[PDB]
Design an enzyme around this catalytic site. Structure first.
Site, PDB file in Angstrom:
ATOM      1  N   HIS A 135      56.169  40.449 -44.675  1.00 31.70           N
ATOM      2  CA  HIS A 135      55.023  39.645 -44.168  1.00 31.70           C
ATOM      3  C   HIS A 135      55.500  38.277 -43.645  1.00 31.70           C
ATOM      4  O   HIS A 135      54.777  37.684 -42.847  1.00 31.70           O
ATOM      5  CB  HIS A 135      53.970  39.492 -45.270  1.00 31.70           C
TER       6      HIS A 135
ATOM      7  N   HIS B 159      58.601  36.651 -48.954  1.00 35.05           N
ATOM      8  CA  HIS B 159      57.693  37.699 -48.425  1.00 35.05           C
ATOM      9  C   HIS B 159      56.252  37.287 -48.750  1.00 35.05           C
ATOM     10  O   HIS B 159      55.443  37.409 -47.861  1.00 35.05           O
ATOM     11  CB  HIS B 159      58.168  39.117 -48.750  1.00 35.05           C
TER      12      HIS B 159
ATOM     13  N   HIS C  15      47.093  40.591 -51.157  1.00 32.37           N
ATOM     14  CA  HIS C  15      47.615  39.276 -51.599  1.00 32.37           C
ATOM     15  C   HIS C  15      47.243  38.226 -50.558  1.00 32.37           C
ATOM     16  O   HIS C  15      46.988  38.602 -49.414  1.00 32.37           O
ATOM     17  CB  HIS C  15      49.127  39.344 -51.818  1.00 32.37           C
TER      18      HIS C  15
ATOM     19  N   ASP D  11      49.512  47.002 -47.581  1.00 34.67           N
ATOM     20  CA  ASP D  11      49.145  47.123 -49.018  1.00 34.67           C
ATOM     21  C   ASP D  11      47.625  46.968 -49.194  1.00 34.67           C
ATOM     22  O   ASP D  11      47.114  47.385 -50.250  1.00 34.67           O
ATOM     23  CB  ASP D  11      49.939  46.127 -49.875  1.00 34.67           C
TER      24      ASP D  11
ATOM     25  N   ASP E 272      49.409  35.712 -49.919  1.00 36.48           N
ATOM     26  CA  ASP E 272      50.753  35.384 -49.377  1.00 36.48           C
ATOM     27  C   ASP E 272      50.776  33.868 -49.096  1.00 36.48           C
ATOM     28  O   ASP E 272      51.233  33.500 -48.010  1.00 36.48           O
ATOM     29  CB  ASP E 272      51.085  36.230 -48.128  1.00 36.48           C
TER      30      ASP E 272
ATOM     31  N   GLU F 211      54.813  45.143 -44.146  1.00 38.01           N
ATOM     32  CA  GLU F 211      55.159  45.627 -45.512  1.00 38.01           C
ATOM     33  C   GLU F 211      55.198  47.158 -45.515  1.00 38.01           C
ATOM     34  O   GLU F 211      55.030  47.747 -46.588  1.00 38.01           O
ATOM     35  CB  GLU F 211      54.213  45.026 -46.557  1.00 38.01           C
TER      36      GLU F 211
ATOM     37  N   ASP G 178      48.412  43.363 -43.481  1.00 37.65           N
ATOM     38  CA  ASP G 178      49.383  43.824 -44.499  1.00 37.65           C
ATOM     39  C   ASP G 178      48.955  45.238 -44.890  1.00 37.65           C
ATOM     40  O   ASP G 178      47.737  45.449 -45.075  1.00 37.65           O
ATOM     41  CB  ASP G 178      49.451  42.847 -45.676  1.00 37.65           C
TER      42      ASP G 178
ATOM     43  N   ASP H 142      45.015  41.794 -46.362  1.00 40.98           N
ATOM     44  CA  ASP H 142      46.119  41.931 -47.346  1.00 40.98           C
ATOM     45  C   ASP H 142      45.512  41.850 -48.745  1.00 40.98           C
ATOM     46  O   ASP H 142      44.552  41.076 -48.923  1.00 40.98           O
ATOM     47  CB  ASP H 142      47.151  40.820 -47.151  1.00 40.98           C
TER      48      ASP H 142
HETATM   49 MN    MN Z   1      51.036  40.383 -47.333  1.00 41.70          MN
HETATM   50 MN    MN Z   2      50.209  42.696 -49.437  1.00 38.44          MN
END
Ligand code: MN
Ligand code: MN
Ligand code: MN
Ligand code: MN
Lengths: 308, 211, 317
Positions: free
Chosen positions: C97, C137, C122, C230, C124, C273, C228, C120
């Site tokens: 990322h 990341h 997260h 994920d 980040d 990712e 992202d 995402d």
């Molecule tokens: Mn991310």
């Molecule tokens: Mn993520």
């Protein structure tokens, strides 16, 4: 605040011996660490194992094995009454769904104006004759509905149970597998419920908003969350004795628990029908157990984003 | 037997300045940055200088470090009583694929003036005598500063075998001292008519005798 | 429109590398064919620097890869600035990322009034002081925020980055895992976000409607979609880094991308990712890769109910 953890290793004759290990499984999934992390004061009361011991299987399931339950529930209700009077919120790990009798009974003794939210694929509102003596896990709620007493028989070991709650004070969520009489009872006695159809009809958000408008609409009341693990889709909850397909998404069950927490009125919780032997693999077991831990934790504040 | 080359021992006068050098190669000091660590008489060394010329807060400006090509340098002005310790130069080696250090440079900041070692040695014990294990004990104390070279004069000749001697270390009064034991068989002590412990410091010799 | 495809094989050392194959996997899932079919001009710029992760030991982790990454992002930002000035929309395949630094930087150089949508699990958004040593990341956003600058340290290779975006101009979607400081940062600096709870509580449709009212509410602006992988439930997206359960449904992520397309203002996209080494099986890999292709394609018009591909009339026997 404060949380009391009560192991209740109940079992139906022969078919699902394992489910009593459920409590230990949820424990072994780090239940204590997670509730600890939320900032909850944690008194664990261990397991209140079968007082007369697991009696050897011969006759019994139709005679002494259900009594051993009836009285076990009496003991539980006492521990719950004690824990609830001491100011604790009550977490009850199962074990089969029968322990709901004791917990809602013991809870009602200091919280007589309590309401119930029943998250389960089943209604478990059968009578002691209608759904036999195999087990009462599908047969509890009757013992606790004041409207159903004229149609329930005094059984050996259940002499102590007094009807805690009105029919307009329990609300069901997750109903997908149901015996005909249960349907009749629910329609007949005018009991409020939201099944998967109603879930698909209105969406999880509206369900909780209506549920709270029904139970605690005009007056704050302490809430008893009885959560049956099969309520989650079997893909999520594969280690339950009798799993029904077309069940709740992970996100939906966390959303329920979260919503319940935000009312702030959660007084006791049951997490039951998790038999780990039912799992094909270690991962199936642990994933179900881990899901349980989440549900309890979400109910006591844990949000998806980390506010630690 | 380390990686970087430091000078084993430096000494100077209180109030003066000293420089410790660190010799390396392309693989270590050549292309990567160097650091300086002060380890005391005992206990865990601490970061003194990092990235060639950087001091952690609390490390005074009396210290500094420098570096060019395959060598670096630690400078200490206003030299003080507390400063005497073992000094290590540390950098990164790309060819060895390991963080590497110098042998270490011991400092003896001259806090006091020189002191003579008044050596007192003891012979085989009556018990040991009949016990067939004679252990000659020649203990050295109340001297300043630094380690004293110890030797065992044996039967009008030298002797280095079965011999152990401790490191110099100061007591409560700051008198550095060490001990040496000569292990012989009873026969080794019988035939040889003479024995002596030969002790030498910065200056002069003081040896005792046993027969 | 016109679309520029940029491979950026970034990494955070051994045990976390393999994501570099990320772009190649998406490519091998027929990314080019599908964007071609949508009727968009395709200039592919191949892979970027792909510094062969030096000696894979040493202090390379400590300084060599992070210094090289910081500069790799600089190169990327240049390519993006060039592609964006030439009128192209920018697709950036990842890779970790961290490539979000360069892309949002390079994008901002010609589109200084751009806004970000961050899909995402997260946020980040850590500071480099908060790094987990396996570093960058999941803290890329910090360098870009022009209010967290006074609390983020000038690192080796990152001298070039100047804070592109305000806190009120990035909106997050899909939050499921967040470290305590990140939560603090988001509450403290008043950054808008919609997590799975908000998704469940409001519905995907309302999330996008709010998101657009926040970012492009009073002024038309170019949108930077950083996606992202994920973000999607691990059942859908099993070949990612630090994947979290309770993630977005396939239909929800298509719905996002679709909604983003309809605004018309999509200026650049990141898809990151997408580590295939993470997959247990070929199918797990390809299913994640194929999901990626869909997300990009949905963002650039692919409608599921049938493509926008013109048909004047049908044949005659
Ligand atoms: Mn991310
Ligand atoms: Mn993520
Ligand atoms: Mn059930
Ligand atoms: Mn049940």
């Amino acid at each position: 605040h404060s949380v009391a953890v009560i192991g209740a290793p109940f079992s139906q004759g022969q078919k699902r011996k394992g489910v009593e290990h459920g409590p230990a499984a949820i424990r072994e999934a780090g239940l204590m660490k997670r509730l600890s992390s939320l900032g909850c004061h944690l008194k664990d009361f261990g397991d209140l194992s079968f007082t007369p011991v697991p009696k050897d299987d011969l006759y019994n399931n139709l005679i002494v094995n259900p009594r051993s339950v009836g009285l076990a529930n009496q003991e539980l209700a006492e521990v719950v009454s004690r824990a609830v009077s001491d100011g604790y919120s009550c977490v009850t790990l199962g074990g089969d769904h029968s322990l709901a009798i004791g917990t809602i009974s013991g809870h009602a003794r200091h919280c007589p104006d309590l309401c119930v939210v029943w998250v389960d694929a089943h209604a478990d509102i059968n009578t002691p004759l209608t759904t036999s003596s195999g087990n009462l896990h599908g047969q509890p709620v009757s013992f606790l509905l004041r409207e159903l007493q004229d149609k329930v028989p005094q059984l050996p070991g259940f002499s102590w149970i007094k009807p805690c709650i009105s029919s307009a004070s329990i609300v069901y969520i997750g109903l997908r597998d149901v015996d005909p009489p249960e349907h009749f009872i629910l329609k007949n006695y005018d009991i409020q419920y939201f099944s998967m159809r109603d879930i698909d009809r209105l969406g999880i958000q509206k369900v909780m908003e209506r549920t709270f408008d029904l139970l605690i609409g005009k007056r704050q009341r302490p809430i008893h969350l009885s959560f049956d693990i099969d309520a989650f889709d079997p893909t999520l909850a594969p280690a339950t004795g009798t799993p029904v397909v077309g069940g709740l998404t992970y996100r939906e069950g966390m959303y329920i628990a979260e919503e319940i927490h935000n009312t702030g009125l959660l007084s006791a919780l049951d997490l039951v029908e998790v038999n780990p032997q039912l799992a094909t693999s270690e991962e199936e077991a642990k994933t179900t157990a881990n899901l349980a831990v989440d549900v309890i934790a979400s109910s006591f504040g844990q949000t998806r984003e980390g506010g630690h | 037997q380390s990686v970087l080359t430091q000078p084993p021992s430096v000494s100077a006068a209180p109030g003066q300045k000293v420089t410790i050098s660190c010799s390396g190669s392309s693989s270590n000091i050549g292309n990567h940055y160097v650091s300086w660590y002060q380890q005391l008489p005992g206990t865990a060394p601490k970061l003194l200088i990092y990235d060639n010329s950087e001091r952690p807060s609390g490390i005074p400006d009396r210290f500094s470090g420098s570096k060019s090509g395959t060598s670096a340098t630690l400078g200490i002005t206003g030299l003080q009583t507390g400063d005497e310790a073992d000094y290590y130069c540390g950098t990164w080696d790309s060819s060895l694929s390991a963080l590497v250090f110098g042998g270490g440079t011991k400092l003896t900041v001259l806090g006091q003036p020189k002191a003579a070692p008044s050596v007192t040695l003891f012979p085989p014990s009556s018990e040991e005598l009949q016990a067939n294990k004679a252990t000659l004990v020649c203990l050295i104390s109340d001297f300043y500063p630094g380690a004293v070279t110890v030797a065992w004069k044996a039967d009008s000749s030298p002797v280095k075998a079965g011999v152990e001697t401790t490191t110099p270390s100061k007591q409560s009064n700051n008198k550095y001292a060490a001990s040496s034991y000569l292990s012989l068989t009873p026969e080794q002590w019988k035939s040889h008519r003479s024995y002596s412990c030969q002790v030498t410091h910065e200056g002069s010799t003081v040896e005792k005798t046993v027969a």
